[PDB]
JSON list of C-alpha atoms and ligand atoms in Angstrom, two decimals:
[
{"chain": "A", "resi": 1, "resn": "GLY", "atom": "CA", "xyz": [0.00, 0.00, 0.00]},
{"chain": "A", "resi": 2, "resn": "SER", "atom": "CA", "xyz": [1.11, 3.54, -0.82]},
{"chain": "A", "resi": 3, "resn": "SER", "atom": "CA", "xyz": [2.26, 5.72, 2.08]},
{"chain": "A", "resi": 4, "resn": "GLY", "atom": "CA", "xyz": [2.44, 9.49, 1.71]},
{"chain": "A", "resi": 5, "resn": "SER", "atom": "CA", "xyz": [0.99, 12.86, 2.66]},
{"chain": "A", "resi": 6, "resn": "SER", "atom": "CA", "xyz": [-1.80, 14.79, 0.94]},
{"chain": "A", "resi": 7, "resn": "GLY", "atom": "CA", "xyz": [-2.75, 18.43, 1.44]},
{"chain": "A", "resi": 8, "resn": "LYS", "atom": "CA", "xyz": [-5.73, 19.19, -0.79]},
{"chain": "A", "resi": 9, "resn": "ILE", "atom": "CA", "xyz": [-7.63, 17.25, -3.45]},
{"chain": "A", "resi": 10, "resn": "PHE", "atom": "CA", "xyz": [-8.81, 18.18, -6.95]},
{"chain": "A", "resi": 11, "resn": "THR", "atom": "CA", "xyz": [-12.33, 16.94, -7.70]},
{"chain": "A", "resi": 12, "resn": "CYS", "atom": "CA", "xyz": [-13.91, 17.21, -11.15]},
{"chain": "A", "resi": 13, "resn": "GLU", "atom": "CA", "xyz": [-17.34, 18.85, -11.11]},
{"chain": "A", "resi": 14, "resn": "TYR", "atom": "CA", "xyz": [-18.21, 17.03, -14.33]},
{"chain": "A", "resi": 15, "resn": "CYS", "atom": "CA", "xyz": [-17.71, 13.29, -13.83]},
{"chain": "A", "resi": 16, "resn": "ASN", "atom": "CA", "xyz": [-17.19, 13.32, -10.06]},
{"chain": "A", "resi": 17, "resn": "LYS", "atom": "CA", "xyz": [-13.56, 12.37, -10.64]},
{"chain": "A", "resi": 18, "resn": "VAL", "atom": "CA", "xyz": [-10.47, 13.02, -8.52]},
{"chain": "A", "resi": 19, "resn": "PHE", "atom": "CA", "xyz": [-6.87, 13.89, -9.40]},
{"chain": "A", "resi": 20, "resn": "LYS", "atom": "CA", "xyz": [-3.87, 14.08, -7.07]},
{"chain": "A", "resi": 21, "resn": "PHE", "atom": "CA", "xyz": [-2.17, 16.78, -9.14]},
{"chain": "A", "resi": 22, "resn": "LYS", "atom": "CA", "xyz": [-3.73, 19.97, -10.50]},
{"chain": "A", "resi": 23, "resn": "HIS", "atom": "CA", "xyz": [-2.47, 19.93, -14.09]},
{"chain": "A", "resi": 24, "resn": "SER", "atom": "CA", "xyz": [-4.10, 16.51, -14.34]},
{"chain": "A", "resi": 25, "resn": "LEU", "atom": "CA", "xyz": [-7.59, 17.86, -13.67]},
{"chain": "A", "resi": 26, "resn": "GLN", "atom": "CA", "xyz": [-7.06, 20.89, -15.91]},
{"chain": "A", "resi": 27, "resn": "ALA", "atom": "CA", "xyz": [-6.01, 18.87, -18.95]},
{"chain": "A", "resi": 28, "resn": "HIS", "atom": "CA", "xyz": [-8.77, 16.40, -18.11]},
{"chain": "A", "resi": 29, "resn": "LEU", "atom": "CA", "xyz": [-11.46, 19.09, -18.29]},
{"chain": "A", "resi": 30, "resn": "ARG", "atom": "CA", "xyz": [-10.52, 19.12, -21.98]},
{"chain": "A", "resi": 31, "resn": "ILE", "atom": "CA", "xyz": [-13.02, 16.34, -22.69]},
{"chain": "A", "resi": 32, "resn": "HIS", "atom": "CA", "xyz": [-15.53, 18.35, -20.66]},
{"chain": "A", "resi": 33, "resn": "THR", "atom": "CA", "xyz": [-16.12, 20.96, -23.37]},
{"chain": "A", "resi": 34, "resn": "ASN", "atom": "CA", "xyz": [-18.82, 21.21, -26.04]},
{"chain": "A", "resi": 35, "resn": "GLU", "atom": "CA", "xyz": [-18.12, 23.97, -28.56]},
{"chain": "A", "resi": 36, "resn": "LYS", "atom": "CA", "xyz": [-18.56, 21.96, -31.75]},
{"chain": "A", "resi": 37, "resn": "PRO", "atom": "CA", "xyz": [-21.91, 21.30, -33.50]},
{"chain": "A", "resi": 38, "resn": "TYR", "atom": "CA", "xyz": [-21.23, 17.60, -34.06]},
{"chain": "A", "resi": 39, "resn": "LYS", "atom": "CA", "xyz": [-20.94, 15.69, -30.78]},
{"chain": "A", "resi": 40, "resn": "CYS", "atom": "CA", "xyz": [-20.13, 12.02, -30.23]},
{"chain": "A", "resi": 41, "resn": "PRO", "atom": "CA", "xyz": [-22.81, 9.83, -28.59]},
{"chain": "A", "resi": 42, "resn": "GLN", "atom": "CA", "xyz": [-20.26, 7.44, -27.09]},
{"chain": "A", "resi": 43, "resn": "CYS", "atom": "CA", "xyz": [-17.88, 10.01, -25.59]},
{"chain": "A", "resi": 44, "resn": "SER", "atom": "CA", "xyz": [-17.59, 13.79, -25.35]},
{"chain": "A", "resi": 45, "resn": "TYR", "atom": "CA", "xyz": [-15.72, 13.78, -28.66]},
{"chain": "A", "resi": 46, "resn": "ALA", "atom": "CA", "xyz": [-16.71, 16.77, -30.80]},
{"chain": "A", "resi": 47, "resn": "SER", "atom": "CA", "xyz": [-15.37, 18.27, -34.03]},
{"chain": "A", "resi": 48, "resn": "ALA", "atom": "CA", "xyz": [-16.49, 21.08, -36.33]},
{"chain": "A", "resi": 49, "resn": "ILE", "atom": "CA", "xyz": [-15.85, 18.71, -39.23]},
{"chain": "A", "resi": 50, "resn": "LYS", "atom": "CA", "xyz": [-18.40, 16.11, -40.33]},
{"chain": "A", "resi": 51, "resn": "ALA", "atom": "CA", "xyz": [-16.18, 13.33, -41.66]},
{"chain": "A", "resi": 52, "resn": "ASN", "atom": "CA", "xyz": [-13.78, 13.45, -38.72]},
{"chain": "A", "resi": 53, "resn": "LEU", "atom": "CA", "xyz": [-16.69, 12.24, -36.59]},
{"chain": "A", "resi": 54, "resn": "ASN", "atom": "CA", "xyz": [-17.68, 9.41, -38.93]},
{"chain": "A", "resi": 55, "resn": "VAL", "atom": "CA", "xyz": [-14.13, 8.07, -38.75]},
{"chain": "A", "resi": 56, "resn": "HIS", "atom": "CA", "xyz": [-13.87, 8.67, -35.01]},
{"chain": "A", "resi": 57, "resn": "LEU", "atom": "CA", "xyz": [-17.03, 6.69, -34.27]},
{"chain": "A", "resi": 58, "resn": "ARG", "atom": "CA", "xyz": [-15.43, 3.68, -35.96]},
{"chain": "A", "resi": 59, "resn": "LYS", "atom": "CA", "xyz": [-12.88, 3.79, -33.14]},
{"chain": "A", "resi": 60, "resn": "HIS", "atom": "CA", "xyz": [-15.66, 2.80, -30.74]},
{"chain": "A", "resi": 61, "resn": "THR", "atom": "CA", "xyz": [-15.49, -0.99, -31.06]},
{"chain": "A", "resi": 62, "resn": "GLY", "atom": "CA", "xyz": [-16.85, -2.54, -27.88]},
{"chain": "A", "resi": 63, "resn": "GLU", "atom": "CA", "xyz": [-14.65, -1.35, -25.02]},
{"chain": "A", "resi": 64, "resn": "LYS", "atom": "CA", "xyz": [-11.50, 0.80, -25.11]},
{"chain": "A", "resi": 65, "resn": "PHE", "atom": "CA", "xyz": [-8.58, 0.82, -22.68]},
{"chain": "A", "resi": 66, "resn": "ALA", "atom": "CA", "xyz": [-7.84, 4.17, -21.04]},
{"chain": "A", "resi": 67, "resn": "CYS", "atom": "CA", "xyz": [-4.34, 4.87, -19.72]},
{"chain": "A", "resi": 68, "resn": "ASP", "atom": "CA", "xyz": [-4.00, 4.94, -15.93]},
{"chain": "A", "resi": 69, "resn": "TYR", "atom": "CA", "xyz": [-1.41, 7.71, -16.10]},
{"chain": "A", "resi": 70, "resn": "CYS", "atom": "CA", "xyz": [-2.84, 9.84, -18.90]},
{"chain": "A", "resi": 71, "resn": "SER", "atom": "CA", "xyz": [-6.16, 10.01, -20.75]},
{"chain": "A", "resi": 72, "resn": "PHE", "atom": "CA", "xyz": [-4.84, 7.96, -23.67]},
{"chain": "A", "resi": 73, "resn": "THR", "atom": "CA", "xyz": [-7.36, 5.49, -25.09]},
{"chain": "A", "resi": 74, "resn": "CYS", "atom": "CA", "xyz": [-6.43, 2.50, -27.24]},
{"chain": "A", "resi": 75, "resn": "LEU", "atom": "CA", "xyz": [-8.42, -0.18, -29.07]},
{"chain": "A", "resi": 76, "resn": "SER", "atom": "CA", "xyz": [-6.21, -2.95, -27.69]},
{"chain": "A", "resi": 77, "resn": "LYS", "atom": "CA", "xyz": [-4.90, -3.58, -24.18]},
{"chain": "A", "resi": 78, "resn": "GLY", "atom": "CA", "xyz": [-1.35, -4.79, -24.75]},
{"chain": "A", "resi": 79, "resn": "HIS", "atom": "CA", "xyz": [-0.65, -1.57, -26.64]},
{"chain": "A", "resi": 80, "resn": "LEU", "atom": "CA", "xyz": [-1.70, 0.55, -23.67]},
{"chain": "A", "resi": 81, "resn": "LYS", "atom": "CA", "xyz": [0.84, -1.21, -21.45]},
{"chain": "A", "resi": 82, "resn": "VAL", "atom": "CA", "xyz": [3.62, -0.52, -23.95]},
{"chain": "A", "resi": 83, "resn": "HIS", "atom": "CA", "xyz": [2.45, 3.08, -24.27]},
{"chain": "A", "resi": 84, "resn": "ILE", "atom": "CA", "xyz": [3.14, 3.55, -20.56]},
{"chain": "A", "resi": 85, "resn": "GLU", "atom": "CA", "xyz": [6.58, 1.93, -20.80]},
{"chain": "A", "resi": 86, "resn": "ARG", "atom": "CA", "xyz": [7.51, 3.93, -23.90]},
{"chain": "A", "resi": 87, "resn": "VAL", "atom": "CA", "xyz": [5.73, 7.23, -23.25]},
{"chain": "A", "resi": 88, "resn": "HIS", "atom": "CA", "xyz": [5.62, 7.40, -19.45]},
{"chain": "A", "resi": 89, "resn": "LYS", "atom": "CA", "xyz": [9.01, 5.68, -19.53]},
{"chain": "A", "resi": 90, "resn": "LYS", "atom": "CA", "xyz": [12.32, 6.04, -21.37]},
{"chain": "A", "resi": 91, "resn": "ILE", "atom": "CA", "xyz": [14.16, 2.97, -20.08]},
{"chain": "A", "resi": 92, "resn": "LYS", "atom": "CA", "xyz": [14.21, -0.43, -21.79]},
{"chain": "B", "resi": 1, "resn": "ZN", "atom": "ZN1", "xyz": [-14.39, 15.05, -15.45]},
{"chain": "B", "resi": 2, "resn": "ZN", "atom": "ZN1", "xyz": [-16.44, 9.11, -29.18]},
{"chain": "B", "resi": 3, "resn": "ZN", "atom": "ZN1", "xyz": [-0.33, 7.20, -20.84]}
]
Protein backbone atom coordinates (compact mmCIF):
# COMPACT_ATOMS: atom_id res chain seq x y z
CA GLY A 1 0.00 0.00 0.00
CA SER A 2 1.11 3.54 -0.82
CA SER A 3 2.26 5.72 2.08
CA GLY A 4 2.44 9.49 1.71
CA SER A 5 0.99 12.86 2.66
CA SER A 6 -1.80 14.79 0.94
CA GLY A 7 -2.75 18.43 1.44
CA LYS A 8 -5.73 19.19 -0.79
CA ILE A 9 -7.63 17.25 -3.45
CA PHE A 10 -8.81 18.18 -6.95
CA THR A 11 -12.33 16.94 -7.70
CA CYS A 12 -13.91 17.21 -11.15
CA GLU A 13 -17.34 18.85 -11.11
CA TYR A 14 -18.21 17.03 -14.33
CA CYS A 15 -17.71 13.29 -13.83
CA ASN A 16 -17.19 13.32 -10.06
CA LYS A 17 -13.56 12.37 -10.64
CA VAL A 18 -10.47 13.02 -8.52
CA PHE A 19 -6.87 13.89 -9.40
CA LYS A 20 -3.87 14.08 -7.07
CA PHE A 21 -2.17 16.78 -9.14
CA LYS A 22 -3.73 19.97 -10.50
CA HIS A 23 -2.47 19.93 -14.09
CA SER A 24 -4.10 16.51 -14.34
CA LEU A 25 -7.59 17.86 -13.67
CA GLN A 26 -7.06 20.89 -15.91
CA ALA A 27 -6.01 18.87 -18.95
CA HIS A 28 -8.77 16.40 -18.11
CA LEU A 29 -11.46 19.09 -18.29
CA ARG A 30 -10.52 19.12 -21.98
CA ILE A 31 -13.02 16.34 -22.69
CA HIS A 32 -15.53 18.35 -20.66
CA THR A 33 -16.12 20.96 -23.37
CA ASN A 34 -18.82 21.21 -26.04
CA GLU A 35 -18.12 23.97 -28.56
CA LYS A 36 -18.56 21.96 -31.75
CA PRO A 37 -21.91 21.30 -33.50
CA TYR A 38 -21.23 17.60 -34.06
CA LYS A 39 -20.94 15.69 -30.78
CA CYS A 40 -20.13 12.02 -30.23
CA PRO A 41 -22.81 9.83 -28.59
CA GLN A 42 -20.26 7.44 -27.09
CA CYS A 43 -17.88 10.01 -25.59
CA SER A 44 -17.59 13.79 -25.35
CA TYR A 45 -15.72 13.78 -28.66
CA ALA A 46 -16.71 16.77 -30.80
CA SER A 47 -15.37 18.27 -34.03
CA ALA A 48 -16.49 21.08 -36.33
CA ILE A 49 -15.85 18.71 -39.23
CA LYS A 50 -18.40 16.11 -40.33
CA ALA A 51 -16.18 13.33 -41.66
CA ASN A 52 -13.78 13.45 -38.72
CA LEU A 53 -16.69 12.24 -36.59
CA ASN A 54 -17.68 9.41 -38.93
CA VAL A 55 -14.13 8.07 -38.75
CA HIS A 56 -13.87 8.67 -35.01
CA LEU A 57 -17.03 6.69 -34.27
CA ARG A 58 -15.43 3.68 -35.96
CA LYS A 59 -12.88 3.79 -33.14
CA HIS A 60 -15.66 2.80 -30.74
CA THR A 61 -15.49 -0.99 -31.06
CA GLY A 62 -16.85 -2.54 -27.88
CA GLU A 63 -14.65 -1.35 -25.02
CA LYS A 64 -11.50 0.80 -25.11
CA PHE A 65 -8.58 0.82 -22.68
CA ALA A 66 -7.84 4.17 -21.04
CA CYS A 67 -4.34 4.87 -19.72
CA ASP A 68 -4.00 4.94 -15.93
CA TYR A 69 -1.41 7.71 -16.10
CA CYS A 70 -2.84 9.84 -18.90
CA SER A 71 -6.16 10.01 -20.75
CA PHE A 72 -4.84 7.96 -23.67
CA THR A 73 -7.36 5.49 -25.09
CA CYS A 74 -6.43 2.50 -27.24
CA LEU A 75 -8.42 -0.18 -29.07
CA SER A 76 -6.21 -2.95 -27.69
CA LYS A 77 -4.90 -3.58 -24.18
CA GLY A 78 -1.35 -4.79 -24.75
CA HIS A 79 -0.65 -1.57 -26.64
CA LEU A 80 -1.70 0.55 -23.67
CA LYS A 81 0.84 -1.21 -21.45
CA VAL A 82 3.62 -0.52 -23.95
CA HIS A 83 2.45 3.08 -24.27
CA ILE A 84 3.14 3.55 -20.56
CA GLU A 85 6.58 1.93 -20.80
CA ARG A 86 7.51 3.93 -23.90
CA VAL A 87 5.73 7.23 -23.25
CA HIS A 88 5.62 7.40 -19.45
CA LYS A 89 9.01 5.68 -19.53
CA LYS A 90 12.32 6.04 -21.37
CA ILE A 91 14.16 2.97 -20.08
CA LYS A 92 14.21 -0.43 -21.79
ZN1 LIG B 1 -14.39 15.05 -15.45
ZN1 LIG C 1 -16.44 9.11 -29.18
ZN1 LIG D 1 -0.33 7.20 -20.84
